[PDB]
Amino acid sequence: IQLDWWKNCVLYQIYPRSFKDSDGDGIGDLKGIISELKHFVDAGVDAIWMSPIFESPMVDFGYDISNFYDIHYEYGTMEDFEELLDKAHELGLKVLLDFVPNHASNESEYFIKSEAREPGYENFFIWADPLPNPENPGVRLPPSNWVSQFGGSAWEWSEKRQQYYLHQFAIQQVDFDFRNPAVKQEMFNIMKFWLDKGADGFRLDALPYLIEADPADHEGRYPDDPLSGLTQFESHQLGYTIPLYTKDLIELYDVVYEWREFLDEYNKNHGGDTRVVFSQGYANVSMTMLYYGNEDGAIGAHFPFNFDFITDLSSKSNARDFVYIILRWLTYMPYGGIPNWVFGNHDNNRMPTRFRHDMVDGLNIINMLLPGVAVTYQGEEIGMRDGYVSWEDTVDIEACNRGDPDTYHLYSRDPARTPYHWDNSTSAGFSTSTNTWLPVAEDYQEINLAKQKETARSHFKNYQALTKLRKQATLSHGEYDIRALSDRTFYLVRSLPTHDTYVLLFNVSERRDTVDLGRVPHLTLPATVYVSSIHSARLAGHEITSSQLSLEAGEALVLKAQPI
Amino acid sequence: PPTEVIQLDWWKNCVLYQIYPRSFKDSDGDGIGDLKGIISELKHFVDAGVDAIWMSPIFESPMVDFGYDISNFYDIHYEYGTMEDFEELLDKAHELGLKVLLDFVPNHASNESEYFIKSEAREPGYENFFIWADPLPNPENPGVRLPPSNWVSQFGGSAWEWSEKRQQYYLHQFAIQQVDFDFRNPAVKQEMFNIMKFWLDKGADGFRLDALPYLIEADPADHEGRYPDDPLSGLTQFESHQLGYTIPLYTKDLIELYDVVYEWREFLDEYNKNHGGDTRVVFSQGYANVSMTMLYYGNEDGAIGAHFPFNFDFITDLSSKSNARDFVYIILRWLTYMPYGGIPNWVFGNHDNNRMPTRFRHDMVDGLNIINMLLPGVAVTYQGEEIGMRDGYVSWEDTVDIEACNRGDPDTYHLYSRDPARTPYHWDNSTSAGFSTSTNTWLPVAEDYQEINLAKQKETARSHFKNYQALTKLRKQATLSHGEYDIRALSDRTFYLVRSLPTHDTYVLLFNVSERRDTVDLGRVPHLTLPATVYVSSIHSARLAGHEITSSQLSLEAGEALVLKAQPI
Ligand SMILES: OC[C@H]1O[C@@](CO)(O[C@H]2O[C@H](CO)[C@@H](O)[C@H](O)[C@H]2O)[C@@H](O)[C@@H]1O
Ligand SMILES: OC[C@H]1O[C@@](CO)(O[C@H]2O[C@H](CO)[C@@H](O)[C@H](O)[C@H]2O)[C@@H](O)[C@@H]1O
Ligand SMILES: [Ca+2]
Ligand SMILES: [Ca+2]
Ligand SMILES: [Mg+2]
Numbered sequence A: 001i002q003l004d005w006w007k008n009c010v011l012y013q014i015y016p017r018s019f020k021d022s023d024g025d026g027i028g029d030l031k032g033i034i035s036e037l038k039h040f041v042d043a044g045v046d047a048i049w050m051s052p053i054f055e056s057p058m059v060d061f062g063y064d065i066s067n068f069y070d071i072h073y074e075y076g077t078m079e080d081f082e083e084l085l086d087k088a089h090e091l092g093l094k095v096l097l098d099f100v101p102n103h104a105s106n107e108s109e110y111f112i113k114s115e116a117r118e119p120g121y122e123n124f125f126i127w128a129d130p131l132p133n134p135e136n137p138g139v140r141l142p143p144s145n146w147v148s149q150f151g152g153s154a155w156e157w158s159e160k161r162q163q164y165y166l167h168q169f170a171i172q173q174v175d176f177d178f179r180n181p182a183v184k185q186e187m188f189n190i191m192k193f194w195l196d197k198g199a200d201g202f203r204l205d206a207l208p209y210l211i212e213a214d215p216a217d218h219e220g221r222y223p224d225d226p227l228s229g230l231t232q233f234e235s236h237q238l239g240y241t242i243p244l245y246t247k248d249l250i251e252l253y254d255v256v257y258e259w260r261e262f263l264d265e266y267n268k269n270h271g272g273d274t275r276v277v278f279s280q281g282y283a284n285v286s287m288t289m290l291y292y293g294n295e296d297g298a299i300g301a302h303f304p305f306n307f308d309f310i311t312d313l314s315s316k317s318n319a320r321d322f323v324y325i326i327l328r329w330l331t332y333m334p335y336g337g338i339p340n341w342v343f344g345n346h347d348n349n350r351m352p353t354r355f356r357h358d359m360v361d362g363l364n365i366i367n368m369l370l371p372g373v374a375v376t377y378q379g380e381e382i383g384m385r386d387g388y389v390s391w392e393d394t395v396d397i398e399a400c401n402r403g404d405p406d407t408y409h410l411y412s413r414d415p416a417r418t419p420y421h422w423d424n425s426t427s428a429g430f431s432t433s434t435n436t437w438l439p440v441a442e443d444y445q446e447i448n449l450a451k452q453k454e455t456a457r458s459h460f461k462n463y464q465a466l467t468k469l470r471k472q473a474t475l476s477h478g479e480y481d482i483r484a485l486s487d488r489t490f491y492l493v494r495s496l497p498t499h500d501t502y503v504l505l506f507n508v509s510e511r512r513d514t515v516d517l518g519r520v521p522h523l524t525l526p527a528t529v530y531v532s533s534i535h536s537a538r539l540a541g542h543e544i545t546s547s548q549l550s551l552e553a554g555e556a557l558v559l560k561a562q563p564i
Numbered sequence B: 001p002p003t004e005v006i007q008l009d010w011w012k013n014c015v016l017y018q019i020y021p022r023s024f025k026d027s028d029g030d031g032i033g034d035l036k037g038i039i040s041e042l043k044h045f046v047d048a049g050v051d052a053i054w055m056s057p058i059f060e061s062p063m064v065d066f067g068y069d070i071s072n073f074y075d076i077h078y079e080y081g082t083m084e085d086f087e088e089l090l091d092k093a094h095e096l097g098l099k100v101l102l103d104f105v106p107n108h109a110s111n112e113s114e115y116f117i118k119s120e121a122r123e124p125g126y127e128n129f130f131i132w133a134d135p136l137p138n139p140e141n142p143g144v145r146l147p148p149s150n151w152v153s154q155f156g157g158s159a160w161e162w163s164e165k166r167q168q169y170y171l172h173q174f175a176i177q178q179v180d181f182d183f184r185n186p187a188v189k190q191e192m193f194n195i196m197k198f199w200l201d202k203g204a205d206g207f208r209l210d211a212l213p214y215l216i217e218a219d220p221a222d223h224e225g226r227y228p229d230d231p232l233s234g235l236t237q238f239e240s241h242q243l244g245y246t247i248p249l250y251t252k253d254l255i256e257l258y259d260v261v262y263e264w265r266e267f268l269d270e271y272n273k274n275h276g277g278d279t280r281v282v283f284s285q286g287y288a289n290v291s292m293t294m295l296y297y298g299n300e301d302g303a304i305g306a307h308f309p310f311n312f313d314f315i316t317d318l319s320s321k322s323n324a325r326d327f328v329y330i331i332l333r334w335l336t337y338m339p340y341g342g343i344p345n346w347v348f349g350n351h352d353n354n355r356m357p358t359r360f361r362h363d364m365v366d367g368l369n370i371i372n373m374l375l376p377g378v379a380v381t382y383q384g385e386e387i388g389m390r391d392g393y394v395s396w397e398d399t400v401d402i403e404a405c406n407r408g409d410p411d412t413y414h415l416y417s418r419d420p421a422r423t424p425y426h427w428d429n430s431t432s433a434g435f436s437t438s439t440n441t442w443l444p445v446a447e448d449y450q451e452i453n454l455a456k457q458k459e460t461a462r463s464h465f466k467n468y469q470a471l472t473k474l475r476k477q478a479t480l481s482h483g484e485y486d487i488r489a490l491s492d493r494t495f496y497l498v499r500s501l502p503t504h505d506t507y508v509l510l511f512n513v514s515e516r517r518d519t520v521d522l523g524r525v526p527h528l529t530l531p532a533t534v535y536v537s538s539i540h541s542a543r544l545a546g547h548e549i550t551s552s553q554l555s556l557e558a559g560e561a562l563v564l565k566a567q568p569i
């Protein structure tokens, strides 16, 4: 039976500001994306989601939204967006928008009206009174010790309103009150507006932070978060507190289930292709699985993002660690759940930087060959590395607020946001201008899409071979078997009776490894190399005939073998 | 017809039972368990379907750490009995077909050992038997003596004790009275061979080897001729005398310890080659991360170590906070990380940790013993798990565990004390649960002995003990010794474990580990064809052994566990 599109799509995250500049201002834009929609068809991408493109002061490059109903002028107009949707659908692509429900810009009308106590907006954000200060009574203390994800107090004093407002993110990102039925209605209004425009669904931002302790349950006070007791964190630094009262509250999931109830209604009433929500939240695996639904029968996000290849694996990982981490989502996911696999995003170091340059193909093979949904971040299809960004060039508010000239590199997301490497032209073909909002990585001459399209073997040609492979019943409907053959090498087998068997072998280590292919289930020899790492001695079409296989450091093969 | 199978070597699928001799059976009314006690109940292990027993330490000991402080590694502690009682235990155990393993503590000796008395005196052959160090130079005021480093004892305080006699510090990672051997001393390493040969020659079938993570510490040659400080944890809740104040980078899990273990295995392999009869084995004790734990089996350069390291995952990583997905995921860790050729093992308790039904729940006893017995490899049972013994209440006044006496006080002792898991075994409802004829026992008998005792569980229709016997009996079936395993969660509440083998019966555990009821589709369980028969059920299950499962829809109560017997694949 053929699956609904979202159950095995290749999903590509576009960071619009760094994708394509169509107008020589050094800033990626919608006309730029429209100009390269054909790239997604060439790559074998099914669906694109864009990081935020709504009206925003750009304090957090779009995650601070001042109007949820119109396009950010630097990216273009409502008309450009409508054209992007039209041409993407024409090419067969699905298009998801980055919805940011936790917070609004302090330049939003919601906030201005709330700060001024305009009726029906007074309780739109979290507003609280100061505490008195025993050590210097002149210096007001905030309602609680809560710490912002971007450093300092999560509480900002409003001169105008004579109260503190909550900001789990930047001072300029103001936390909506999700116990307010008017806030919750406004979220339906925003989603209805963009679905009415033709959007294929939403990526839902920062959900762990939706709800904080109600002061009603704590004698009218905001309860302090427990202390970590780690001496490397001072009271203004993220890590000083354990976010017991400020993150992963059980009530956040009820909001998500209400969103899915609304979306299921909409899909029923409008028909056509299913519109989906994919949720973003870094949390422990059990809190992450409540985004899918709960055991009482609630249904949530079509899936929450799996960040395990970001959070729990790196160049420090061995083959047993790879297998053990891959098994986590597969062990914890509810029955009928769609697995997904994320290798990078705009908040984390790029895939080849976190792992090694020689592991790029193996990592893209894992993404494409595991059951479910492959997620690609902008650049991973060509093996883009972290770009060098000086203190002087750093614009990430997280790095500016938490960091300084000596430390900024511990915090900055900018190195994973440097402009896309189209070719070896000025600014790697991202712009006609040499003034890119972030500096272009120094290695764009070695690493760009044009070069990879015209070399016999490249990351991009491997990417294309893998997205093409996902059309095979073996990958859409086959079983999986995964195990380590040593500390250095593991296998992943997809099998399905009467259909071809596909086997990943991946030496994730820095050393040669010789493995016994007789230990691999469902693998009969001779077998044919379908894809090999760009540094493999073995080419596509090569026959593997010996049961003893030496893999070089980082080497990955996909073998096509006889059906079970 | 059912295929023939070649029987496994004994140690690859034994049920291994840990005896804590002080708490097992008092034969003489002193309230202290003893060897004649154990001899009198060797038939209990045959009745239970145990293949091998290991005893916590019975060697001469001042009893500061109840046997782990050994003053003579070549004789028996007088409270437990004599060498002759030991020889008698071995003979009668072997006559009944049991294997017997001794617990040997290689890391440290009693300060009452001749080794330490000779070492403290700088006697030739023994001066460098232990780790002796000068004070750290304190030029900033030479008046005050500083210890060699900030190292913290596992039992609280400095790991360094000043000897007025020798005018140097000695290392004790445990109690002041437990002195760390120098494992870079070839004479120490040879003495460890001499001890194991002596007990193998008596006819021990092998050893459990204690506290192996602590064998080797940093060599001052690598740190400019001083003992390097352990890094600070920087946790606000620990001061410099408190375990937790340091990270044991220079004091635990050093790579050189594994070379000692591989040398033990080399010595044992040669001994087995030169004596024949059944393989003698070493099982290693070490609490460490999974990568450091698997190095006990061997390494990927071909080194071979312990027959296995103990798997403590059901103690360290699962509890009553765990759901069915946690259970599966933790079970998969040993199976994923274990090297090719390695024998899995499963440990639910010991003399250092809370009892299984206390860590989990009282309603989970059967399900936990089923997991132990149905998983592939070796089931390890701690004294009392076969009847579902719970922790005993032990007051501060009755607390004798040196770790609690050193680290704890009237308000805190319960955080550290191992005594609740060491309370005397519940034989029956007589005086002191039939452990002793006296009302005076070395630790108090748990208050629930009238409700939880072996004799009662033999007389009643359904019991933890009767389920245990049924499971150890099932382990003789080819499906459990030789069969494949499949394990997955059906929900957050219920997982399955299927043992299957073409032409032999299929066996399926279904376990609701949650506090809520769960209904599951048995159609999702691989190799399960209905109708199927309940082989074992939890003592409060709606289903008795022999109950026919015909419906593909199965409702399980909180804690309920079933083993189903189903037609061969
Ligand atoms: O380091 C970023 C920080 O924020 C998270 C929260 O889920 O990411 C999302 O939310 C932020 C505020 O809207 C954005 O800055 C970020 O870009 C967005 O993806 C996590 O990545 C992390 O905790
Ligand atoms: O809490 C006790 C402490 O010691 C360990 C070390 O592996 O256990 C063994 O070593 C001790 C000293 O010989 C004994 O007191 C203990 O009974 C013995 O099992 C661990 O359980 C722990 O780290
Ligand atoms: Ca919030
Ligand atoms: Ca030692
Ligand atoms: Mg532009």
Ligand SMILES: [Mg+2]
Residues within 6 Å of the ligand: A347, A348, A411
């Ligand atoms: Mg970060």
Ligand SMILES: [Mg+2]
Residues within 6 Å of the ligand: B025, B026, B027, B028, B029, B030, B031, B032, B033, B034, B079
């Ligand atoms: Mg006695």
Ligand SMILES: [Mg+2]
Residues within 6 Å of the ligand: B352, B416
């Ligand atoms: Mg303890």
